[PDB]
Amino acid sequence: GQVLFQGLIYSFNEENGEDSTKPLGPCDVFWVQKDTAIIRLHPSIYTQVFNILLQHKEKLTVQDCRYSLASVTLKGAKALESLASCLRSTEYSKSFEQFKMVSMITDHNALPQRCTFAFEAIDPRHLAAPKKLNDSQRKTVNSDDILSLHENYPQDEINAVFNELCDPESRTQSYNNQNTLKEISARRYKLLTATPNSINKTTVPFKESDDPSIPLVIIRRLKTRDWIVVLPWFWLLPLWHLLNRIPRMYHIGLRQFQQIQYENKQLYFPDDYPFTQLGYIENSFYKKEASKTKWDRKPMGKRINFEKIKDIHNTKLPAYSGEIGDFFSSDWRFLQILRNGIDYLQRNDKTLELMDGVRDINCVNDVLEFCKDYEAKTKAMSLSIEENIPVALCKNRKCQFRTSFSLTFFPRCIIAVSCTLLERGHPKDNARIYQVPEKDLEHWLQLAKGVYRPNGRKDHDLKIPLPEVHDLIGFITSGTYHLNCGNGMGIGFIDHHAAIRQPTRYVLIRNVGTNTYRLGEWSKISV
Amino acid sequence: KRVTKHPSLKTLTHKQIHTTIFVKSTTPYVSALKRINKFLDSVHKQGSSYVAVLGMGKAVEKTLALGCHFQDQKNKKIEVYTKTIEVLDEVITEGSDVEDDDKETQLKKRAVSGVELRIYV
Amino acid sequence: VRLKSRYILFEIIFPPTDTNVEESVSKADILLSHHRASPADVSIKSILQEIRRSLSLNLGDYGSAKCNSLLQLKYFSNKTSTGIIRCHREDCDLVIMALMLMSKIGDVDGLIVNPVKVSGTIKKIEQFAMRRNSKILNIIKCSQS
Amino acid sequence: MLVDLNVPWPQNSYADKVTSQAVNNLIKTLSTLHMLGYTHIAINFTVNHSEKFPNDVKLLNPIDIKRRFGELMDRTGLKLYSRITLIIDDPSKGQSLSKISQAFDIVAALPISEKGLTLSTTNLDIDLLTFQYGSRLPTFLKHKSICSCVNRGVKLEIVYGYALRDVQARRQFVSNVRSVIRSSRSRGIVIGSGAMSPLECRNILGVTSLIKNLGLPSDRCSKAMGDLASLVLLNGRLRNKS
RNA sequence: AAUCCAUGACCAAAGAAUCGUCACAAAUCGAAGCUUACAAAAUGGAGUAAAAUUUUGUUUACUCAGUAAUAUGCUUUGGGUUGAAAGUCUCCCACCAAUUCGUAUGCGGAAAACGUAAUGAGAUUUAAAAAAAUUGUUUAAAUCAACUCAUUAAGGAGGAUGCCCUUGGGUAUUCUGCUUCUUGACCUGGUACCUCUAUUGCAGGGUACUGGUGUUUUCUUCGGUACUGGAUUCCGUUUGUAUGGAAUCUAAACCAUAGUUAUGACGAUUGCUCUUUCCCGUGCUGGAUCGAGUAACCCAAUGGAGCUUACUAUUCUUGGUCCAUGGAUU
RNA sequence: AAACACAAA
Numbered sequence A: 001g002q003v004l005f006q007g008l009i010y011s012f013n014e015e016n017g018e019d020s021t022k023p024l025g026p027c028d029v030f031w032v033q034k035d036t037a038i039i040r041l042h043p044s045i046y047t048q049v050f051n052i053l054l055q056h057k058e059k060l061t062v063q064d065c066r067y068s069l070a071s072v073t074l075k076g077a078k079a080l081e082s083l084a085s086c087l088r089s090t091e092y093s094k095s096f097e098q099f100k101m102v103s104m105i106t107d108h109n110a111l112p113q114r115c116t117f118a119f120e121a122i123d124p125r126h127l128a129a130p131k132k133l134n135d136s137q138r139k140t141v142n143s144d145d146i147l148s149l150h151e152n153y154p155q156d157e158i159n160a161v162f163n164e165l166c167d168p169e170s171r172t173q174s175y176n177n178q179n180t181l182k183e184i185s186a187r188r189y190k191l192l193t194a195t196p197n198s199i200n201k202t203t204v205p206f207k208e209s210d211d212p213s214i215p216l217v218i219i220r221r222l223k224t225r226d227w228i229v230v231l232p233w234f235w236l237l238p239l240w241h242l243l244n245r246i247p248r249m250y251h252i253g254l255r256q257f258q259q260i261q262y263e264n265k266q267l268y269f270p271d272d273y274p275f276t277q278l279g280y281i282e283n284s285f286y287k288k289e290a291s292k293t294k295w296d297r298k299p300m301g302k303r304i305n306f307e308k309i310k311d312i313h314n315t316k317l318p319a320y321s322g323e324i325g326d327f328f329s330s331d332w333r334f335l336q337i338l339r340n341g342i343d344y345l346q347r348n349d350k351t352l353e354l355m356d357g358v359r360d361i362n363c364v365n366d367v368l369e370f371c372k373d374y375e376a377k378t379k380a381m382s383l384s385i386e387e388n389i390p391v392a393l394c395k396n397r398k399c400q401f402r403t404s405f406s407l408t409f410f411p412r413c414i415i416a417v418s419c420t421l422l423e424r425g426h427p428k429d430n431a432r433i434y435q436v437p438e439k440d441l442e443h444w445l446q447l448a449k450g451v452y453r454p455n456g457r458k459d460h461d462l463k464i465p466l467p468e469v470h471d472l473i474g475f476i477t478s479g480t481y482h483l484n485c486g487n488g489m490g491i492g493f494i495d496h497h498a499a500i501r502q503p504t505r506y507v508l509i510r511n512v513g514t515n516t517y518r519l520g521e522w523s524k525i526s527v
Numbered sequence B: 001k002r003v004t005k006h007p008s009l010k011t012l013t014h015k016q017i018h019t020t021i022f023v024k025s026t027t028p029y030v031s032a033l034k035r036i037n038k039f040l041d042s043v044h045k046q047g048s049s050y051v052a053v054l055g056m057g058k059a060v061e062k063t064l065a066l067g068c069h070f071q072d073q074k075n076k077k078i079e080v081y082t083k084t085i086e087v088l089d090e091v092i093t094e095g096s097d098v099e100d101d102d103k104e105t106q107l108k109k110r111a112v113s114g115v116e117l118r119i120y121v
Numbered sequence C: 001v002r003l004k005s006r007y008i009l010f011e012i013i014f015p016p017t018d019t020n021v022e023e024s025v026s027k028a029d030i031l032l033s034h035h036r037a038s039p040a041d042v043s044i045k046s047i048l049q050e051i052r053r054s055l056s057l058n059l060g061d062y063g064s065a066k067c068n069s070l071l072q073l074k075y076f077s078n079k080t081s082t083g084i085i086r087c088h089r090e091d092c093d094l095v096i097m098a099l100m101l102m103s104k105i106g107d108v109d110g111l112i113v114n115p116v117k118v119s120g121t122i123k124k125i126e127q128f129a130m131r132r133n134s135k136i137l138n139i140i141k142c143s144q145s
Numbered sequence D: 001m002l003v004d005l006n007v008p009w010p011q012n013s014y015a016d017k018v019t020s021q022a023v024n025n026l027i028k029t030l031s032t033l034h035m036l037g038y039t040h041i042a043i044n045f046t047v048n049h050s051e052k053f054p055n056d057v058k059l060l061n062p063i064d065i066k067r068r069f070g071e072l073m074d075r076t077g078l079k080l081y082s083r084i085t086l087i088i089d090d091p092s093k094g095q096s097l098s099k100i101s102q103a104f105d106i107v108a109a110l111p112i113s114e115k116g117l118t119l120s121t122t123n124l125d126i127d128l129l130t131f132q133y134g135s136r137l138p139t140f141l142k143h144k145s146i147c148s149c150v151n152r153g154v155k156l157e158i159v160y161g162y163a164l165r166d167v168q169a170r171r172q173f174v175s176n177v178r179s180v181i182r183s184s185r186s187r188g189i190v191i192g193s194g195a196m197s198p199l200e201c202r203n204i205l206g207v208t209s210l211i212k213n214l215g216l217p218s219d220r221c222s223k224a225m226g227d228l229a230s231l232v233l234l235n236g237r238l239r240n241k242s
Numbered sequence E: 001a002a003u004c005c006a007u008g009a010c011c012a013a014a015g016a017a018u019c020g021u022c023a024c025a026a027a028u029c030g031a032a033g034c035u036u037a038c039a040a041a042a043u044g045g046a047g048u049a050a051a052a053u054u055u056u057g058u059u060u061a062c063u064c065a066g067u068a069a070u071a072u073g074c075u076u077u078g079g080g081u082u083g084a085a086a087g088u089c090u091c092c093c094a095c096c097a098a099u100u101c102g103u104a105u106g107c108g109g110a111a112a113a114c115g116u117a118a119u120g121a122g123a124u125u126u127a128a129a130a131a132a133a134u135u136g137u138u139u140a141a142a143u144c145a146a147c148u149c150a151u152u153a154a155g156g157a158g159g160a161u162g163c164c165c166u167u168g169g170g171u172a173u174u175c176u177g178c179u180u181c182u183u184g185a186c187c188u189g190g191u192a193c194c195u196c197u198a199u200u201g202c203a204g205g206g207u208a209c210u211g212g213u214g215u216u217u218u219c220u221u222c223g224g225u226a227c228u229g230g231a232u233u234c235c236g237u238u239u240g241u242a243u244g245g246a247a248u249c250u251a252a253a254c255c256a257u258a259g260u261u262a263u264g265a266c267g268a269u270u271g272c273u274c275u276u277u278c279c280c281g282u283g284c285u286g287g288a289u290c291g292a293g294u295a296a297c298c299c300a301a302u303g304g305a306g307c308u309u310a311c312u313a314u315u316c317u318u319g320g321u322c323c324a325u326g327g328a329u330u
Numbered sequence F: 001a002a003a004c005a006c007a008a009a
């Protein structure tokens, strides 16, 4: 079906009969003619992809496209009605016959997954004004047309356009006669005097000899829910101009791109992904140094004091006395070492003690001191020697999720979940995710059901049951007020063992400076 | 059997979408009242006369409740129409171990009855 | 810079003090019997003088001196008995307590003053007055049946 | 929502029978209350501690809300509750609450002597304690008994209606309300409207501004007036039923 | 001359955070949001119980989506937003293989009366400060510090010098020198070729070449193309273009994780600066009582960047420097 | 009030 998908890429490396793979990141793979495969992804990781590809090129041909093929993204309901108002056809084709009817659908989710329209378009500088297409059969649009769209498909012209765009000879022949703005101006000035002296035409007809045919591709993405359009590098500017000329189209940026990706359920690669190598490395680095510069920039008595915050965890221990993790970044190394220590405590005894060159660790303070000592040793040298958190969503189904004294050798799997706030509260980035304890389990259930005042309104001005310290099972990476539902959406990553531990989906959320615990429920995300 | 349901085809030009509220199954009552009041106040600036209230399936009951509210509360003429809505569903047909989401998708039609509720000013 | 203003909306309500006559118990009936009309001897300078006298009589000398700096009646008509009193954001409580402690007009007796809306701009006051006037018509239309 | 729990009934003793004019004036006052905007109404009935309580159960309440105000309750859409205050002077001719607490809903007291304050703080199952705001307060309000009666649950009631009667008693009312605000430390302060005529009725904004200028903070006013009044009503209902 | 202590002067950084509460089927000092309509119960759903009917079929009385929705409620933030909102400062917010600053010019930058780096000099006796904006004082004039102006084009290769190091390699400076290549200041005259005005000499435009300062003294904008709100109707089409032509009515384009004289009211908690106290180890953003204070400039009206100018004396603070002085030791 | 100007002062 040659449909475009958005999956997770890996770095494979086999030297002699051995196979060790590492989490790489995202990628977009597309097949054409069962041989021509295009792979598009982030440049920073594209370098490594190209390297690991070129190292194995004995029976394969590689072609880089960094300054000869470009793609631009359209989002919204009326995104295809403007792309159609800009694009025109040089010769009759069924691709355009389907695209014309698609432009009137106005609903992207109603269309099926397989939707790829490619043809040869005219240069957008040729058109004077973005004239809209014929709108007369707008009322007679039923589901039979969408049913027939899956059957009727001109594969031959699609493959021809794809081979023209892939081959570097036709791609260069497209630049044969690229008329200048002065050329088009003179042609439009001389179209004033034509043979039919009854109709005023502000456009210029197409020529099969002295005119360039431009190959274009349109694909729809299911995960991101957007329409990507691919066009040569030097041809993107004339299309981009006429696209922006539509007075309902604004330019979206990387910040707003991350916002749109976070809004639905999705994730951003460098900022959100905590388990890949380069993404997590650069996340930890840039965010930690930036927050530390903003922190040390301010003087004493002007910044929030993470060191001195009382009543954060019941039965406070004299180890940190402030924040349990990192004051600036959402650190998963501390979470991993702490959970490893707690697991060792459960493996040595049924109960755990709180207060009392490897030491016989008998309390939580001993593990907190080990974490602090690891951080004090890391103060000077690089971090992330092996990893902190992998992601194993399929491995548990494949064989099993399986549970010397290192405390930092084996990592802990996490699942991508979305926890939503069901009550008063506002989340933020680098937030802490705790699990509801067993003793005060009915109080949170009654609060989630309802506790009102004699006046009638809700009642949350009560004493909260501050939980213990060994209950942190996750960190929120994308904390922003959800505007699509009216509440606080939290995008975090919780442990699978702790997910199977609880019999309920209730989870507490806390900030990095705030000492309040909000309640919510999480839902799994398959990304 | 795994089967997914997509929304129904909506072809609204520029103003049918503005003066129309699509009542979901999870849409609250008071928020619907607020949006209906806003639409009623913005109609004559959009240049229409009535406000469309479309709901199908589970939300039909509370859509009729919204209609009956403004029926006598504000004394505004309401019109109830019964229409049919066709929805396309992607089903998997039997024909190693692949992903459940990445299987053979076949489109199937399903007709459901719905209520359109117009409110005058 | 900006002068912090705070307008005050008040209503003159006449309780139907007549124990010899039986009355109808409903919403619109009592709304009509309480919003009947204002007497002819009602104006802006007659209400301003009365409130100025009551302010000095209840608060005192300094209480009237601090409050009478920006005490003006911007909009008032005797057909609907709705007035907008401008004052400072500091002395809003004083003006509200004086409007509560209003006993009677020098010639017209048997009336109460109800402060409804307090805001720092006249546009929101006008919007709230229009909303209240629209709400009043609903119970009237319902009871006319 | 608002709660008014100090509407007086035009009857002091048991012997005097009520007239139609008094009932009409009470209806006028309640209709004015509902017009200004209120939710809960609890009319009060004054009686003396020396007057002989009848040995009945179905005759203790000369109000009969169901036959008189039950039709207004259905039409205008409000509710009514029964409340009785105890004008206590001397510990004699008393020692009976298990029969007066089941009939009425809210039980109040009115001490006018120094021994009355002790008897109210020690051996009375009451919810609110009120003073004669019109005339002089009996001896002196101190923190000693006020703290011990507020820590258990008894609040102090303030009648903002008594000020609207004349001009001379306004000074005494202010001197008593500031005293009780200074002594109670602004925790258990409930407000009530003791007006029998519709010409002495006010709204929430004016009363709030008055109590704020008298010495009560803005949060205390709203919090008390709403929640403490609703809680007193709920406690009275629970005392009547279970 | 070294170190320490106290004062003063000058440069640089930032503008503490958290929780709860405030009547009205609507409200508040205000604001936004909870709308891609379905519980596969529409391929004319799945079954149970009774009567009658020679089974079908039909009439009554029920079960199933249960993680179920819960009626003016509910969640969020709002005057320094990655410090000045203040200011009669500058600039972007259509394009143009080019009469359109075709500007490879120290670096960064789309631009900026924009940031910064190395060297030399300067003070109404000067390139220019004294007898466009901004600022109460408004650069300097022993030395330092600060302002202004004048030079230094990007990358690769060879030699010399200095440092760790003495196979060798790395960094900094300086000299020779190559690579970085869109037949373009503007304008006049002559010659040669082609097209239209439907024969020619001639009249106008384009291109290739040569010659010249040629009154380019309007020393401040002067080139080309482009209907960007919404509704509906008419007509032609496998003879050609697979889409084009025109018509009627209205006024909207209304948009801020503050948004248009709004940004409220108090209560509670931690932290920050000094002072009168007690303990371990001297000390330790070591701990707890008796107390005082939480600053000033000042405030959005479309958005972003640069610069300048106001602030921090019991009217909160922080870091460093000083060929400034004061005391002591060597 | 704010915000604007080859104004005006």
Ligand SMILES: [Mg+2]
Pocket: F002
């Ligand atoms: Mg301003």
Ligand SMILES: [Mg+2]
Pocket: none
């Ligand atoms: Mg100004």
Ligand SMILES: [Mg+2]
Pocket: none
């Ligand atoms: Mg300004």
